[PDB]
Design a binder for this molecule. Sequence first.
Ligand SMILES: [Zn+2]
Ligand SMILES: [Zn+2]
Ligand SMILES: [Zn+2]
Ligand SMILES: [Zn+2]
Length: 506
Amino acid sequence: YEQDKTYKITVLHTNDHHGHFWRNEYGEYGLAAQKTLVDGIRKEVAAEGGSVLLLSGGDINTGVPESDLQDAEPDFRGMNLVGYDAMAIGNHEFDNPLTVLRQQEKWAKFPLLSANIYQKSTGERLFKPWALFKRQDLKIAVIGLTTDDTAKYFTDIEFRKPADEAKLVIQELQQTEKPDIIIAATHMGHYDNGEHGSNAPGDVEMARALPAGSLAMIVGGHSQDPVCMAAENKKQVDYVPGTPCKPDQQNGIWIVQAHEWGKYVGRADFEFRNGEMKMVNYQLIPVNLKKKVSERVLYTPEIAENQQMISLLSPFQNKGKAQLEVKIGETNGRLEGDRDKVRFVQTNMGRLILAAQMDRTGADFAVMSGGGIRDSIEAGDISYKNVLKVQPFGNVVVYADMTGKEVIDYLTAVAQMKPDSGAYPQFANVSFVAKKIKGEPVDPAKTYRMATLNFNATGGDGYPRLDNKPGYVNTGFIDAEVLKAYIQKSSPLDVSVYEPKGEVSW
Ligand SMILES: [Zn+2]
Ligand SMILES: [Zn+2]
Ligand SMILES: [Zn+2]
Ligand SMILES: [Zn+2]
């Protein structure tokens, strides 16, 4: 670089896209709007003679039926048109057989990075560990790292420790390419003050374990939080879009994350001079997010939807929408989901839905509030559209490993919820008489696994929070997808097997 010259670099980032290539019901986010936003910033920055780099923290896969049924093809084609430079591989790119990932790699015009995923047999990396970008005189290197919790398709696949692979890699780069700047795009998660709990160490411990400022910044994901600091080592709890956002910085390394689903495009403006990399500004830019006030009003000026992007994706949206009509299985009887009934008594729909949740998570028992079941499935053929009417809100399946004592306190709390309300609890593998888990009595000093929905897990309908506790894991699998997979796996269905035989009572 020319000695003593100020080079301007803007880094744009998103993460945990999860199938959201199209705007939602309320016309929020979607890739067509994101493209107008990004072209806008490029136009701007180019006029000032600066550089732009657009990075992704991973998890493009899994999250919306129309995307899932098409192996996220519209999402990667959309990203190509938005112009992504690189992407870190996320844990959800492994929801499909590796051949599908290799295929998404053929569709992606930009590289998919991950330095820590090895093939056991050979002992070699399966993907490119980094990518080099030349912007003006600067040589910028982007390293990719993937959470080693992903193993939760992994035959002959090893996820080595991110923080340690990062060190090796940072060395190979400096001896080899000698970059002026090094950025890590990672899919590991941000945990306040490194308190990752039962999860694998994330961005904060990595930054604290690496040598001081050996990385300009870490563009993250996985935890899916907009990383805005309220205090030192504390993210704000309910970040409000459109308001100031202060990135975290540990051991001289900036750590950022843009939440999830294309909801925000993060923007970090830096000035590089004589080797000093300086962040002169940061902001989390909302993509047509609206607040419910009732009405839903935009937090910021509306961003128009790029028409070329709309032209590209509209075929995929119609195709995926049509493919919901396809039959996924059959049932020999009515699955009872009428609200006049799922908010008063236990029904077979409740049992089926929770049967599918425990199946995906390996849970010992499960619970959810009755108001979450939105419709019934009459006897006969079942389509994906039929399940989406039952589970239309896209809540996520989570689970919590807890002790006998804890399950007793939780259920006792939940057994309090009253009928004739949406907070009324549907149980599975639990039997009682108010005034045993899976038949056997509850060993107090035993660890049991409970599955439920993120909604109730965080307090929804007033249930006890599991949210902030050790052993809690959000799987990122969507309610309707988990039901749909269980159903086709279990067809033809026999509602007999799901009839509640009076096991819990008051
Ligand atoms: Zn994710
Ligand atoms: Zn993830
Ligand atoms: Zn959100
Ligand atoms: Zn009714």
